[PDB]
Structures are given as C-alpha cells and as structure tokens.
Amino acid sequence: GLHMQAIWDKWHAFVPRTYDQWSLWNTVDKLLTQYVNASMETTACEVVGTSLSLLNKVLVENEVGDIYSYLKILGKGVNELKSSILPENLVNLFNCLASLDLLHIFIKYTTSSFFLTDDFVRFIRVCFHSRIGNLLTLLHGISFFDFCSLTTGNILGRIALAFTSANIFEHARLALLQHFMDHSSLLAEDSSTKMNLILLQRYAVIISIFLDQGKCEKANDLITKLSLPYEELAENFVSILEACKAFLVANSEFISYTYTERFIHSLRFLQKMLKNQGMAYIYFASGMLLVYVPDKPFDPASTVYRSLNESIVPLYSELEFFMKSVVLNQYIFELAMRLSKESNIAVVEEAKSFVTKWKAYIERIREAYPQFVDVYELILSFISFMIYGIELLMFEAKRRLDERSQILSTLILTLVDPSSFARSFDDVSNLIEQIKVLNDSIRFEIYLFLASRLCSEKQHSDTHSLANSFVLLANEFYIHNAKIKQKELEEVVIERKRFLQLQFAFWSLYNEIYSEKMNVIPLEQLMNTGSYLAKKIKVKNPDMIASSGFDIVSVVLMMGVKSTNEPSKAIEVRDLIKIVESRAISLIKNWPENFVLRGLKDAIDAILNLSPFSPIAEYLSKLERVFHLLSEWEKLASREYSLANEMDLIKKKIIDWRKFELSNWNNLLKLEEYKLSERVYPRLYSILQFIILKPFFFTKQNLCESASIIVQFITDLTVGEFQLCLKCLLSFSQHAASLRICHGIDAMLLNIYHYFEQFLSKVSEAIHTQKQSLENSIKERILLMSWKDTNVYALKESAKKSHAELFKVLHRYREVLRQPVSSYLSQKHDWDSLENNSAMWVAKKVNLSPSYIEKTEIMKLVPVRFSNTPTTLRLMWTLFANVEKSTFTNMVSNLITDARELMKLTPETINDDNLSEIKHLKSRKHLLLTETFKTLKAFGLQYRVKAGIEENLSNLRNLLAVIPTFPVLSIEKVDRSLMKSLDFIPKFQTLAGHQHNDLVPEVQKGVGLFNSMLSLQLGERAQLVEFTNELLALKNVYSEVYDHDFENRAQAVSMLCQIYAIVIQKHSSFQSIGHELSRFADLLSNKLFPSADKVSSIRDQQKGINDLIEYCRKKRTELPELSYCFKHLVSLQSLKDEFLNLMNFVLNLFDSLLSSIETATKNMRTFKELAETSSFIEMSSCFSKVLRAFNLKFQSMKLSSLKEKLRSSSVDKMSCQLLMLFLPVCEQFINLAESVLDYFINVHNSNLDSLSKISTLFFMVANN
C-alpha cells in the first residue's frame, strides 16, 4: 500500500522490448539452459556461452536477426551437445562456490557489468557445472546461495566424496579442487562480512533513490556507493551513521527502515554477528518492501515488453498474498522475536517452513507471470534478502539450541588444519574431555593422533607437558581396555579387533617414546594421517549439523587434495577382472546361455562385492571361482564368441599371486611374534600402569609395590617375553620417571630392570637358537615346494598340504615360545679373569683466555691472588697426576690364582692319589678356607653382625627396592656387576642345609662376612649416588652460564614454516617458492637446535627471521596463493660499585674450590698411603670422606654467583674479565669431578665384582 513507482524507474532493469524480443529471450534461455546441463570441453563450452551472451547483449541494442541464424547455429551446436551425462550427489560445494561467485559478482562490482569481465567467466564456469532458467538469473543485468556465510563444514562431504566408476568421480574431484584453486582469493578475503557491505550498498541505492534533489545528500550517495570496498569498509560506521541522520530527514513511517540501521551498525562491530546481521537484513527487507508494495497495480507502464495483456492485477494479487503474510508484520516481527531468544524446538520447524514456503512462492512468482518482469524482479530480490535473514537467524539459533554438534566442529577444525598443527596440557585435557563428550574406534584413533603429535612436538625438552599428556592418554586407554575386558566377560568383534590393534599401537609408541632411538615421524605423514582420521571422522558423523568455526575454510579444502595425493593390489586385479567380466557379460547378454550367464553374473556380483584391504585372499578365492566357471563355459562350447586372452592374463596373475603367497609364507615367525606381543602387552600393561599410574592422586609402600612388581616379572615366565618386558619396564620407568608426581617409583623400576638385567643374554641365546631351528625348518618346507609348472586345479590342495606343514610348525613355535622363562635366571661356577684418571687440559678449549692472559690491567688492579690461571690449570692437572694412585680385588685375585693353581695341582685320580695326596690336598683346601677367612676377618668384614642385617637379608625384592640408582657407559658396567652380585647374594643366603655334602658354623661365618661385604658395598653405592646427584646439579649450574627466551616464538614460526611448506608443496609452476621456503625453515630449526661463533649464528638467525618475514611478503604480495597468504598472516601476527662485593664472593668461591681440591689431595693421598695400611674399613671411610670434599656448598655459592650475575647487566670490560678469569677453573673442577667419580666408580665396580667372584667361588666350594 505504498509508492513503488520510481524504484521501477531507478532500479528499473533491462528486459525484453519486442514481442519477438521476448520470443528471442525465452528461446535463447531455453537453449542455453539446456546447454549448461553437463573438462577441457567445459572451457570450450564456456567460450560458447560467453560469445552467446555477447551476441544477446548485442541484439539488446535492437538490430535483430543476426543472432536468429547465429543462435540457430549455436542451437545446432547445443543440440549436438544434447546428443551427449550428469549423475552425482552431495556436490553442493559446487553450489557453495556458486554462492561465493554471486557474492563476488554483486558486491565487488557497482557499475553496470553485462557479463564482460572474468567474473562472468568464473561464474559461468561454475554455472554450467553447478546445480541450478539461467538467463532469468542473468535477468538483473544493467541493474543491482547465502548460508555459506554460516557453515562451510559441508566440505566434509567433499572428503566423503572420495569414500563411498568412482574414477570419473575422482577426476571430477580434481576438477572441483581445480575450480577451488580458481576461486581462491575471493574465497579468502572474508565471507559473512562482505554481505554486510552488500546490505550497505543495497540500502545505499535505495535510500539514495529515496530522495531526488538533495545536493550534499547527492554527494553522500556518491561517496556512499564509493566502489572501493576496503575504503568503504573503513568508512562503514561513519557512512552508516550519516545515512541514519540523512534518513531521519525523510517522511514518516520509515522507522522500520530506520531501526534496520541500528542492528546493522553493531553487526559490523561485534561469534554473535550472525543474529545482528539477520535482524538487519529482515528489517531493511521489509522497509523497502512496504515502501515498494502498493495495494493496487502501480506499474512502470517505452522499453517495456510488448504487452497490452495486463493481468498484473492477478499477479499483484498473488504477490499481495505473500505480502499478506508479512503485510501484518506479526509473523516477520514474531519470526524476528524468535531469532533473538527463547526458541526451544518449535521455532526451528516454523522457520524451515517459512524458508521453504516463501522459497516456492518466489519460484512460482518467477515461473508464472513472467509478466511484471521488472516488478517481480525488485520484489523477489527484496524477498531474498528477507529469507536470508530468516534462515541466518534460524542457523544462529539452532546452533545455540543443541550445541552437541559444535563440539564436533571444534574437534574437526582442530583435527585437520594448519591452525591445529601449529602447536597444551590444558588443551589436551580439553580435547580429551570433549572426546569423552563426543563409533568408538575413531574415538580412540583421535587419541592416537593427538599422541603422535605429542611425541612430534616433544623434540622441539620438558616432562610435565608430555608426561601429563601421556598419562591422561593412557588413562583413557586403560579404562577402555578394562571396559572391553568386562564386556568380554559376558562388527563388535571387528570393533574389538581395532581396539586391540590400536592398543598395540599405543603401547608401541609408549615403548617407543622414552626408549629414545629415533622418534621422527614425518610432519607430512602426520598431517596426511590427520586427513585419513578426518574423513574417518566424517564417517563417524552421519549428520551435517556441525557449523563452521569461521576462521579458516580455505587450506582445509586443499588438505583433501594431498590426502587424495601421495592391500591395494586387489584394485588392479579387480580392474582386470572387471574388464573381462564386462566383456563376457556383453557377449553372453547378446548370446544367451541361461546357466553360464547366471554364473558370470554372480561372479561379477560377488567379485566386486568386498572392498577390504585386510581381506585380500578371499578375493583370490573369488577369482579362483571365476576361473573355474570360465573354464567350464570355455570347455563347453563357443569356438568364436570366447574372450580368452584376459583368461590367460588371469592365469599368469594367479600364478604370480600364489607365488606371492609362497614368498610371504616365509613371514610366519614374525606372525606369532606379533600375536604373542598382542596378547602380552595388556597384562603387564594393566598391572604396572595401575600401580604406577594411580599416582596422579611411602618407603613401605615402595617396598610393597616392588614386591608385586618383581613377583610379576619373575612370574612372567614364558620365555621370549622377557626381552620385550625388560625393554618395556625400562620404557615405563623413564616415561613416568620424568613425572615429578612420583619419585621413588623410578628407583624401583630402574633397579628392577638393571637387576633383572643379569640374566638376559643366555635367554636371548636360547631364543635365537629356537628361532634358528624353526627358520631352518621353514627353509626346508618352503624349499619343499616351488614354482610347480602345473596344476591350476591342484593349487588349492597343494596349498592345503603346505597349510598342514605350516600348522605343524606353528604348534612347534607356540610350544618353544610357551616354555616358561623360569629357566635362565641362574648362574654357575666358571673361572673368569678381570683406567686411572683421565683429564681435560682445556686451556685451548677456552683460548680466548690465553690472550687476556697476555692482557686486563683494569682487571689487574683488582688482585685475584690466583694470578696464573694457566699455572692454576697446571696445578690441577699436576694434582691429579701425583694423586693418580683395590686390595680387595688384589687379594681376591691372589686367592683365585692360588685357587686355580691348587685345583689343577691336585687334579689326580681317586684311589692312587688317595694313597697319599688326597689327605694333604683336602687338608690344604680346608687350610686355604681357614687362612682365607682368617685374613679376611682381619681385612674388615667382621662376622657375627646382624644389627643392620635384618634389613638386607630378607625380601630380595624389597632389598633391591632400597638400592638408589645413579642419575644418568661405565655406570652401566658398575651397576651390572654389583646387581649381579646382589643377585647371587639372596640365594646364597638361602643356600643352607646342603653344605655338609661339600662339608659348618664357619659356613655361617662366611654368610655373615658376605653380608658385611655387601653392606660396605651398598654404602659406597649410596655415597656414589649422592655425589652423582650433587655433580648433576652442579653441571646444570655451570650449564646456565641478546635474543634468548623468544626462541619459543622462533620455534613456533619454524613449525608453521614447515607446515605451510608441506601445504604449498601439495600444489597439484608454483614449486619454485616451495623448496625455497623450506630453506628458511631449516635455518630457524637449526638455530632452535643450537639454542662466539654462536653469536654469528644468532645474528644470522635473527637476520633470517627478517628475511623469511620478507621473502614470504613479496610472494604473498606478488602472487595470490591464498594459503600462503593466510600463513603469512599468522606469521606477521606472531612476528613483530659492587665490584668488591661480587669480586670477593667470586674469589672466595675460587679459593674454596682450590682448597677443596687440596683437601682432596690430602685425603686421597692418605688413601694412597693407607691403601694396604688398613683393613677394608679405615681406608673405606677415608675414601668416603675424600668424596665428601665439599660440593653442595660449592653448588650453593655457585648458584649465588649465578643469581648475582644473571640479575646484573653484563659488561665485557670488567664483569666478563673476571668471569673469564674464573669460569674456566669451574669447568676444570667439573672435569676433575667427573674424573674422580669415574676413578672411584670403577674402583667400586672392581672391588665389588671381585669379591662377587670370591662369593661365587665360596658357593662353588659349597657345591662340593
């Protein structure tokens, strides 16, 4: 009931003029719409339709007839195209690119554009492949789909393009990827904000037309249609406010199209923008709608169509009905009210009904009444803005209604995209939490994918992140494992199959994480496996409910390309089979048989049935049945109509296939090996992970847990496992040992390994021996049949014979592995026969010290009183030199030499030497034991002591549990020897009640001296572990001695560099900046790995940071390549006095070190003197006091100077002259520290294993 006149004189589009011109319009429309039904010929037909539009606009200049014949020729061409089709499904992403096309068509062009520029090229190139009269869509020419500003996550279907012949689909998928590369930059500016600028431009047109002669307002329309979208976008708020003010000067009842501008203001200011935009669109829609809605025919009725037919009254009635629904405005307003809030479930149904019903109303308005062409045009354009408003509000509200799907959105955008793989324990907890909130095989598979990314990120050094991540991951896996166990107590079988296999994967990475050989999984393999998990996550979601995250949907389309780029022999075999199957199916479809046709039909029916990559041989069985039926219908008849050449091809293929089964049949020991591990890892997994991973929530507790642990490992008696389990315990040890939510469990695990590490080598020998037996057997058996040169028939029966032989060998291997590992944990009586002090004269290792040793005087005014750091280094080296100077080992060796000499020296016969020599020999043997234990009872080791022996004697498990391990290969030697010693200790204590066979109380005396020896040993071990932890701290202390601590940011930019390098490397004339980019990537990574010549390295590193800021910036500038544009966007986002005090402190520390070394000189020199001048105790405690030369106090003062220097500014002229004058000798102290640690360390190993050999000698004496 309003004006509607001048808009049809100011929008006032182009339209057919003559009745014959309307005939030409509709005829050309019918033709070209047929022509856009259904590669390189697509580009040809694009040129065809382009020139046809050129000629139609030429005829629109009203000189008719040339295109009557010319378009008749083009119609002959289109009809020759009509001899040529197009089935597809879920190709809606083509309609999404079409939407981006129509948006770039409308918004980026303000002038009249009669499809001249390449926007028409991209639009037609989509269009003739797109979904949906095309000239009616062209009908808004000299003038002025939507929800792909909401949810582009329908790209999931694109990866679900490749999932469920399909090679036309696959080259079409490459075509869709090609067109996506074509529509790159306009899809990469921004969606969903450009439509705001579109509403600005449309209302600019309408409100500019709302006046006629406002001069400053005419300049306002001039700048308010200023077709610089960045400049207009900067102008946005100011232009909108000025438009509000100039719109206020209009007539009354404009409050609908005034309050439009309210919501549209903050809509481009606000996540939450969607509802503001939808309200604004519905508002400005109804504003110009009720503006240009009359309650009568107000036509613009030259340049109109030839019609004195005037049922514009009836079409105005039909337009007035859908005006009637919004005429009251209760429903538009009511729908708008529903969009803001309070929508439970009914608003979704009502809104979808409104969208559909008004949509079909617009469609019928298009189809019937082509009359009122200009009228239905402007009206339906406003109504399209309305329905876009109603549905955009519907999508925002339905997202806020049931937010289950947005969980899958935040997972799926962060499961496969560069924004995820940029770079956690909080986020790992969050995504594990949301995964719990998110059939289940994929739900564990994503946990595996996050795990692999965790180990990958692990290389770039911390325990807390990787630790807690892995702990939470294993918590999930253990809960699921016991869930499957209890469910087993009562495709589900296939579900359990994938559960067990991925369980093997998870514990495989768990034994691979901290065993630390080489943990590189390639980042491209990481991302592409992310894509396989992404489309498998697509399989998991049977709904498109998830709504875009709206921060990236551009490169993530290209991740499906590299997934389609970069158990499969079934494909080629089925290809050859399908070729010959269709050949014979046609030749039988034209010459019937009525029996063999059913045969080959069911053959191709079941042959192409399965698509499994684990089932391969069943396809070989299907091909065997096909060759059987083909042999039948070949031998029946038809000397003409047979195919028979691919039959020979199938003969050769089955020949090589059975040959492949013959070769792969050698792989069977690994088969039961992996079956053994798949049954193995869950048990020790659940036990040790329960008692070592409850500790996210003492000494007696550690002892009890060690009792259960050693009970398990010794109870793990099924040989072969012990190699795997020993490796596994070392793994669980370290990869929970870096967790500081337990401390002692590390000691129990590592000692449990390193003293279950005695027995390993003989077990390995027996294992490889039985392996040799079965391998020789299999070599004979697969040698016992060859390329048979016969028997297409008897192939299966010969295979059955080999299957019997393999079954025999499998039972044999199951037996040999199923033997218990209780066997090889012992030792026996075998004669065996068994470094001083290294250094580092590191004056050249500093050597910028020699120059300032020739230079300075400002430092020389200060007296250090050391005064020759050269001669200080000489003094330290000369100290170790003279102090370079074991009797337990030495007397043990003298006794063992006498033992071998006597053992051969009375090796004579029984009766003849029993005449004389047996008496003197046996009595001398007893005298050897007597004087041995006597001089022993002198040499320390007093008998009859049990005050601290009640600890060491019982619970060999818990006695092992006390043994403190060293912090960080001589250490391995020492630990192996004394752990073997303590291994012999428990059974030797338990070895009473059979000594009189060897033939007393002195047996108890020997047992006591043995316990005393092990006690002195273990105390030496405790002091060693103490000095080890102390020097480890001090090495970290000296370890902390312009650009630093932003190296985290450097590492992150390197990570993104490598990621987007793989991305642009998936381009399939663009590879030139591919490898080039990677060059910069590697330099930054090398700098991170490094984190004097290093100052040049960091200078070059920061200069490379500048360069790779610039060498992307030109390529982002001088080339669109919009993936690299987003990457460089994230890159550029990430990118841009007390002299006496510390002097006396430091020289005090230096002299403290020098006197500490001199104290060590006195102490170990006395140890050298009182070496034999002692009895195993005095020199023992003396050496313990020698090691008790002060370290931790020196560690304290070193940390004091570390704090005093780190907080303070570093000056090369004075502060660094002293630091150079000192810190060298600190390095010297660390050097000689590790030297003495090794010297006494190997001394401990020497004396320990020497008396351990003496103890095994005593047990050998106890044998007989």
Swiss-Prot record:
It is found in: Nucleus; Nucleus, Nucleolus; Nucleus, Nucleoplasm. Residues 1-1264 are annotated as: Linker. Belongs to the midasin family. Associates with pre-60S ribosomes in the nucleoplasm. Nuclear chaperone required for maturation and nuclear export of pre-60S ribosome subunits. Functions at successive maturation steps to remove ribosomal factors at critical transition points, first driving the exit of early pre-60S particles from the nucleolus and then driving late pre-60S particles from the nucleus. This is Midasin.
